[PDB]
């Protein structure tokens, strides 16, 4: 009739899941689990409410729908986009979350990591191949949960002050999961006192917006940020920016038939269906970018009391441990989507005025001073013109600015206020990924190590790349389990050591052992975050 | 003598035979060129000398014009060699013509010095200068003159007629016109002068290539360690009146008229003892008193007249030491002492970067700060040294020069450019300080030969391809000896340039090109 492990009580109703298969052996899964009331209809652009208790066992078998978001279309069938796209039908109706356990469940408490998507707050899904929990869960023993987040418009308009668009409700969607793991996880043989968030960009900024929110940091105990920060530029928005881009995307599906009482116009917007406001959400924004941002996260007083920057300044970080880190080129995926003499299917080898045209997409809006200071900076003065260099130069703009630098900034304030910080820098190169040499390790690969999707037998990795993964997802594990990714108790393995402000130590992640280094482009991250905010002010 | 005796326009000279290791060289030191500018005349133009009867005595060096004298470290011979070697007096117009022995009798090629000492100070009397070795080794004919500086040369009331301003620039000018008419009666050509100078010489040099009432009085020009768009080699006219009026204030002067009038009573002492306090801040520099853009002599600046200009048909020779920062930081900058290793804090070096570059934004100091920074070791004292000594020669030497190259090169002109790598075994400053500013000179001059002195044997040999490339170029506008590794010209793109030291001559690229984009390209827009 039926099986224990893959039934469960959690405090809303009964669940079943199911077992799985992997290469080291069974893990169980519950995929599906609603922990909000669907934000459909008059819920839309509102925070959401906690799921009602049901009656009956809720199946909790497979991944529920994607958030509504854009789907990208730049290289159609091509793996290298497709794998970040919806493997779901599009739904309001997504705020559901997955939990993976080991199969029996553990019978002591195990801690618990809680994945973040990212996908630049416009897009995303716990659903993805590459966020399969069941490698990690079977090879370490943990609990993983992944939840699904609203993203673009539905999470993130905001009319500031307003009750009926308050903005955030897509961190208050990642808050209301961690929330049900601090109530449900010990039904899964989960450890609520020892919780690791971690995330990939948009994800990495989250985890750090969490941080940063009192009512969120009481859910968790550590944390890890992968290729990005909440003080990115990208990452958030001004209360008046927010509405002016609220507004015009209300102007452009006809709403208010400009401005006005913000609950007509709020009203208005949610008789449109989702898929309208999704395509014009591109319109939005003031400059032509490579970062088709509209809705992100807003400084409003309330999720966050001030800037990220401001924040992380001011912040006691005693008893926090951390660890983040990069990919080696952390730009080059980026200058696909927009940078002229850019593409996937050539060398770019772009020309001296293609690289300053991409100054400005790569790095919009700041004044012209600011941009020659970039020009200035960036270019090497004996090889002004050589195509190959401008190329490298511009994804290292791109890359410093949006991910490195903020990723510094926040590892140096973090560790000189308290922190215990890992930082890391992942330098392979896959043997089954699709884009042209030239981008080398791009933004989001080191992920797909981390989940341990090169021991899913399907796929065609190496060996020595099997074991990689092994060695990350023991690191990340060791961290979760400890703060510290360093073996307990195994001396004549290379040591990880903790980045200060001072020595600026970090290793770099591939398949030689562990190399300790320092500064995580120190020169370029100075210009980004020591003199170019003074330029800012005078 | 005959070969001692000249009759040049204004009457008859008597010169002296001087002695080197390669044979006699015949000398003319102390000719007057120019009305000595006193009383009445001071602060004008200089007026050319009057006719005199019977013969001037020409065997040794004539006055030093008035300037401030180094006092930190007295007896110190890496200060003593640039101070006055002869009494101060504003008598003080004279030049000098070194010719071989006996005089040429056929037109020999002439180079013309112009001295560096900030516009504040220098003497063509100084040992380093001596004539005499360029002269035997090479067969030309050497010039040098005294011209007028600090107030006394620079002091300007723009608009008047009494203080126009930049008359030290014209003494230089009227002694090019004398070379003009007077130095066929020594055997010289005065179709073929070549310009050289280091420092303020350099701008100055630079300054005469960019006034058209001096491009006819030469043909070819040599700047060493300076250029006419330096930071301190100009004032605008507002800031010139305002120092002026400053000193007139500080010795007890109430017009532009009456003004002159009551610092024309002063003794020139009084002037030099309070020039150094009218400066708007503290500085490593004591360059009060500059040249001034008023239209005339400049009929703009410096930057603005070089990126205007055709230079097709002038050949440049450039260049800088190794090390053009280290001598000024021992003037004020906090920590900085020629007795020790002179090891900086952050503090300290963060304090260096306001004084060697003084009057900038707070903005433009933190970009100078970022910059030159090692972020990787941003407290190391040793490495602290050397960038404020980087700073300090970018921003006052190398790149204005490197600017001056480009654009001379991008219009037109053929330049050749280098940099001096050989720290002189006899050098007296301490080791921390490489190759200082001023110090390519002795070599130049060949002063290395003096038996006297203490030089190796390889030092020697390399005065001599110094004196050799320096002639060369002199006579035909390319150093090079015939084909030993050759010396390309400079361009705006490729950017070579040789280094001179013991070894043969290396190519190389850029001149601090990052840093000069620093300073060239960006700091301007800042300003803005
Ligand atoms: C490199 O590619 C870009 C992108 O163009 C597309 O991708 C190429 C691989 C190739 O398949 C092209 O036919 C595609 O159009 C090129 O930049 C484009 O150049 C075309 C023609 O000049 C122009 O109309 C587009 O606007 C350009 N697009 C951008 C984003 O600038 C680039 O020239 C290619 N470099 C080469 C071929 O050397
Ligand atoms: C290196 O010397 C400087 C200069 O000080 C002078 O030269 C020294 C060799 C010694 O003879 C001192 O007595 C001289 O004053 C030092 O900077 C000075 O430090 C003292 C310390 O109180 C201070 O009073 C002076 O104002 C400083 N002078 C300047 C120009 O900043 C420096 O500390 C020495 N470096 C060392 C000792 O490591
Ligand atoms: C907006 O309109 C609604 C519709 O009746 C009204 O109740 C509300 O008071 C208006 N908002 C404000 C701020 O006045």
């Given at each position: 009739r039926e099986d224990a492990e893959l039934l469960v009580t959690v405090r809303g109703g009964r669940?079943?899941?199911?077992?799985?298969?992997?290469?080291?052996?069974?893990?169980?899964?519950f995929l599906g689990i609603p922990f909000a009331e669907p934000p459909m209809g008059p819920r839309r652009f509102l925070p959401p409410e906690p799921?009602?208790?049901?009656?009956?066992?809720?199946?909790?078998?497979?991944?529920?729908?994607?958030?509504?978001?854009?789907?990208?279309?730049?290289?159609?069938?091509?793996?290298?986009?497709?794998?970040?796209?919806?493997?779901?039908?599009?739904?309001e109706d997504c705020l559901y979350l997955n939990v993976w356990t080991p199969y029996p469940r553990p019978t002591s408490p195990t801690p618990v990591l809680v994945w973040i998507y990212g996908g630049g707050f416009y897009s995303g899904a716990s659903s993805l191949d590459v966020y399969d929990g069941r490698f990690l869960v079977?090879?370490?023993?943990?609990?993983?949960?992944?939840?699904?987040?609203?993203?673009?418009?539905?999470?993130?308009?905001?009319?500031?002050?307003?009750?009926?668009?308050?903005?955030?409700?897509?961190?208050?969607?990642?808050?209301?999961?961690?929330?049900?793991?601090?109530?449900?996880?010990?039904?899964?043989?989960?450890?609520?006192?020892?919780?690791?968030?971690?995330?990939e960009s948009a994800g990495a900024a989250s985890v750090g917006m969490h941080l940063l929110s009192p009512p969120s940091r009481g859910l968790f105990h550590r944390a890890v940020l992968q290729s990005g920060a909440p003080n990115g530029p990208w990452a958030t928005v001004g209360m008046g920016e927010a509405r002016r881009r609220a507004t015009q995307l209300a102007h452009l599906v006809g709403c208010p038939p400009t401005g006005g009482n913000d609950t007509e116009l709020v009203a208005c917007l949610r008789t449109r269906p989702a898929q309208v406001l999704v395509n014009h959400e591109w319109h939005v924004l003031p400059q032509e970018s490579v970062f088709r941002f509209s809705f992100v996260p807003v400084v409003d007083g309330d999720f966050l009391s001030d800037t990220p920057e401001a924040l992380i300044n001011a912040g006691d970080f005693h008893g926090l441990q951390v660890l983040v880190g990069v990919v080696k080129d952390e730009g080059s995926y980026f200058l696909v989507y927009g940078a002229p003499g850019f593409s996937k299917d050539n060398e770019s080898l772009i020309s001296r005025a293609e690289f300053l045209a991409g100054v400005r997409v790569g790095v919009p809006q700041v004044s012209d001073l600011a941009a020659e200071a970039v020009v200035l900076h960036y270019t090497d003065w004996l090889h002004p013109e050589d195509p190959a260099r401008l190329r490298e130069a511009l994804s290292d703009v791109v890359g410093d600015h949006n991910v490195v630098c903020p990723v510094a900034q926040l590892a140096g304030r973090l560790a000189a206020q308290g922190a215990r910080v890992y930082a890391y820098v992942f330098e392979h190169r896959a043997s089954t990924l699709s884009w042209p040499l030239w981008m080398g390790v791009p933004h989001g690969y080191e992920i797909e190590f981390i989940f341990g999707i090169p021991l899913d037998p399907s796929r065609n990795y190496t060996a020595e790349e099997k074991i990689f993964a092994q060695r990350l997802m023991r690191y990340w594990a060791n961290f979760a389990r400890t703060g510290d990714p360093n073996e307990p108790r195994d001396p004549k393995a290379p040591q990880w050591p903790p980045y200060t402000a001072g020595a600026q130590q970090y290793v770099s992640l591939d398949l030689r052992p562990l190399e300790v280094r320092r500064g995580l482009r120190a020169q370029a991250c100075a210009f980004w975050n020591r003199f170019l905010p003074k330029l800012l002010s005078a």
């Open positions: 669940l079943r899941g199911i077992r799985l298969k992997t290469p080291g052996g069974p893990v169980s899964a799921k009602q208790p049901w009656s009956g066992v809720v199946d909790a078998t497979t991944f529920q729908s994607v958030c509504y978001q854009y789907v990208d279309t730049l290289y159609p069938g091509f793996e290298g986009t497709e794998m970040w796209n919806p493997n779901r039908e599009l739904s079977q090879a370490e023993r943990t609990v993983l949960v992944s939840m699904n987040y609203r993203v673009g418009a539905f999470g993130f308009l905001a009319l500031p002050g307003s009750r009926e668009a308050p903005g955030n409700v897509g961190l208050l969607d990642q808050r209301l999961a961690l929330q049900w793991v601090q109530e449900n996880v010990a039904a899964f043989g989960g450890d609520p006192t020892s919780v690791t968030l971690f995330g």
